[PDB]
Symmetry: D3
Subunit: 153 residues, 6 copies
């Protein structure tokens, strides 16, 4: 671990409600290093490709419409065990089952309007697929953050 990466995304509800800074501050405070960041408007092709596992499900179109309703802030974050860690930080999928101190536990209320997305660490390879899906290799940035020498042994 250490140069592990994950895809993380302030969803359109978090963007609208003015929580980009707050959320990025939590990942920066943590020592996680930003290596991708992009303010964008997901299109149909990308939305439907992102939720492909849910194609045949009834709720699919509503899901595409929401993630489409307004712009997102897509991120790639780097650090030891980043993928699991970001998921611990965000809370449970449902904000109403999330503990205070998690992103969703502090900022959210509804299951389907949960402010943020992070690659599932239990879906092996998910982080990579999501990253390549949202960022071209050129959009990613190789650097060394000041913090790194004091974050890791």
């Amino acid at each position: 671990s250490e140069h592990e990466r994950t895809f993380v995304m302030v969803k359109p509800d978090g963007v609208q409600r003015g929580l980009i800074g707050d959320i990025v501050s939590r990942f920066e405070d943590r020592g996680l290093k930003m290596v991708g960041g992009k303010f964008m408007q997901i299109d149909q092709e990308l939305a439907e490709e992102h939720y492909g596992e849910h194609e045949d499900k009834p709720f699919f179109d509503g899901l595409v419409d929401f993630i489409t309703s307004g712009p997102v802030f897509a991120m790639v974050w780097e650090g030891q065990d980043a993928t699991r860690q970001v998921r611990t930080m965000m809370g449970e999928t449902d904000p109403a089952e999330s503990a205070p101190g998690t992103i969703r536990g502090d900022y959210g209320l509804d299951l389907g309007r949960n402010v943020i997305h992070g690659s599932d660490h239990e879906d092996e390879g998910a982080n990579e697929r999501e990253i390549e899906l949202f960022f071209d290799e050129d959009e990613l940035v190789d650097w060394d953050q000041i913090d790194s020498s004091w974050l890791y042994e």
Copy 2:
């Protein structure tokens, strides 16, 4: 759910120690909507009516004296599953058994000086009784917060 309400109250210890803002910021950050707010001094009649279930208990008079010792900030908050949610946010009844990130876990130390009160969701109807007890219908405010359209499906 969604227009569900609960009664919440910064107790005299939280008022004294300067935590009104901090606590209201946590509920505002969450998307919960304020529909009642009142800086007040509870009297005997109201204190004893509030803790009526504890009339015959030895500790009753001490409890009335504390909630009487200085002014409170009483609130009504609105949102999906508000009653349970506020209780998750505050922590356990004892601050010394509360997790960091909860109100009591971050700001409190003593069981009997726990900075805040929130209607018990497990006492069905408690929120309503507490609300009507502290606020007249005219003191409550029907509005729509900006946030609502992005907080709920």
Copy 3:
């Protein structure tokens, strides 16, 4: 002074945008003492009294409409030089003229949506009338905050 009081309210824009906590904090942080606090909706009649000095002016109805368009959080604060201090803290009337640090310089953009009101120290007695205007004497609370022992010589 020491017991000087000033009328302050979070205007409906500031309320909508979820700035009540952050505002109350700035005042508690400062050592100012909350002695009145009332989440309310200004009715028309009250709104026209409050702006009575501008009644024969073109922009009068616009002012009335806005200030009544959503709930406010009306407050009373107590401390040495409270009125002037609160007006220093808020900024200039136009937030477009306000310094970073001040409430308006950090939170607002348009002269008309300047988020907050506070009694003008340069109009003697203003604090007095506006306090009386929004608050019956019995809504206000005499107490002693532990901070004062160290706030004042």
Copy 4:
């Protein structure tokens, strides 16, 4: 204005020191709207275009080296009087001359490592060119933030 736009970027010092969140917050807090956002590394060629006005000056290469020495977070913000407002918020050029409250007055120390850049309102069209310089039109997002309904008269 209302839809006026300004180019802002967290310089490599500010990025290294973990100040991206805190910076984006100050702008969201303010009600400014993010309409462009790109974590990137300025290549040399871009860096020399951006500083083209200083090309025949001694300190030119130092400026190029620094601005390319690490990733930046480049942004576009939208609001009434955005450009001037952003420059008020940042401070003076020298942080050693900047007031507490301003981004530089709180976070920076040396004229050369002044943490952040923002288009100069006193050089008309500057915002326009620098925006175009860092962003292709299609990287920018037309949307409506719920805040504006209350941010603007």
Copy 5:
């Protein structure tokens, strides 16, 4: 309980990464009272005496080298059940197994670079040994904090 004390220490990673304030603010917010504070550079004698239980362990020298690599901020904190409470606040020993809202859960990533140390409440007497080890009796301060009368019954 109430005048119970524990030894707490921002480790060299927390010092370097600029988290003294943030951590002290969490203990002050909590009502815990500072009665010892000291910015210092631990020497060999003290480091090896502190980790004496780990003398024969292979990892001992690396542990001494890290706690030696840069200065610490050593503290003594006072309050009811302080020793357990500080340990709840910091998280688990491993930051990657810590919940958001804990010090390590918010600020750390690596097991061996966990920003902070707090006396183990399950090692009876540990707090005292650690305190006497780092502070002479004269370096400690007997006072009464303002908060105390509202923190405890």
Copy 6:
């Protein structure tokens, strides 16, 4: 400069009101480096030396009594133009004259309880003597903070 040092202390009012963290943060935030840090009680003799310039003045004993009435947190900070920078950050002597943003403008109210002291840059050598006055050379720490690589050209 770069290695210039300044003496700063949170006065007993600021200590009582739980402002040590918030103060240290403002300085870490800024990139100033803590090189001395000592929670202490000024004895009378020290207090009279520190205020020696006012010894033949009426208000002298009041000053001595106050500064010795409770613990202080005495500090030393290192950075380019540290002394002037710290005095800009604090505000004016009177907090009633201080701007929002400055430590005193946000946290204090009365000229006499102005929460914090910092060496005067307009009295050359002041920083030197006050540092020596509160700190033996060996209490101070030579180290390198990772921030400087990016804080200074």
